[PDB]
From a paper:
Fusarium oxysporum f. sp. lycopersici (Fol), the causal agent of tomato wilt disease, produces effector protein Avr2. Avr2 is required for Fol virulence in susceptible tomato varieties, but triggers resistance in plants carrying I‐2 (Houterman et al., 2009). The Avr2 protein is recognized by I‐2 inside the plant nucleus (Ma et al., 2013) and exerts its virulence function inside host cells (Di et al., 2016). Consistent with the potential for Avr2 to target a conserved defense mechanism in different hosts, we demonstrate that Avr2 suppresses PRR (FLS2)‐mediated responses, such as growth inhibition, ROS production, MAPK activation and callose deposition following flagellin22 (flg22) treatment.
In an attempt to resolve the structural requirements underlying I‐2‐mediated recognition of Avr2, and its relationship to virulence, we determined the crystal structure of this effector. Structural homology searches revealed that Avr2 shares an overall β‐sandwich fold with the Pyrenophora tritici‐repentis effector ToxA and TRAF‐domain containing proteins, despite sharing no identifiable sequence similarity (no difference from chance). Given the lack of sequence identity, concluding that Avr2 shares a specific function with Tumor necrosis factor Receptor Associated Factor (TRAF)‐domain containing proteins (such as interfering with host ubiquitin ligase activity) is not possible. However, it is tempting to speculate that Avr2, in having this protein fold, may function (like other TRAFs) as an adapter unit, competing with host factors for target binding or binding to a host target and modulating its function. The crystal structure of Avr2 has revealed that Fol race 3 variants Avr2V41M, Avr2R45H, Avr2R46P and Avr2T50− are all within surface‐exposed residues that cluster on a loop, forming a distinct epitope. Notably, the residues that form this epitope are anchored in position by Cys40 forming a disulphide bound at one end (the far N‐terminus), and at the start of β1 (residue Ser51). Such an anchored extension is not observed in ToxA or other TRAF‐like proteins. We predict that molecular interactions involving this region are critical for I‐2‐mediated recognition and underlie the ability of the Fol race 3 variants to evade this. Our screen identified two threonine residues in Avr2 (Avr2T53 and Avr2T145) that are required for virulence (suppression of PTI), but not for I‐2‐mediated recognition. Avr2T145 is positioned within a putative functional site identified from comparison with the ligand‐bound structures of Speckle‐type POZ (SPOP) protein and TRAF6, and Avr2T53 is positioned within a putative functional site identified from comparison with the ligand‐bound structure of SIAH1.
Author numbering: 36 to 89, 94 to 163
Write the structure that this text describes.
Amino acid sequence: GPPYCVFPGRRTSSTSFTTSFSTEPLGYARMLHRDPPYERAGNSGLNHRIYERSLRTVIDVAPPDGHQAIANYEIEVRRIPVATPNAAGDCFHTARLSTGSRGPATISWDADASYTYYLTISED
């Protein structure tokens, strides 16, 4: 069915990670890479990366250091139309990192500069 987002209906916890990002106008040059750096996803115990590939926007979420996930995690992206301060936003894509998986959990979409994107990662 349509993507279902539990956040922001529910509140996030101390080990959740949230961030937002913009996509640049597609006429602005990027230097693309087959394997861009992972960064720690705040206090979640996971790593993440947000990048583009030939354009597609991609989010990967994985345990550190070749480990398996020790729990189940919900990964959600909402998109909010730009220049619309009263916009409600849409639940856009979701993914799961399941207990025992190695990852990454991945989400991708056709790159679009007309929305701001909001990522949440949380343990179930």
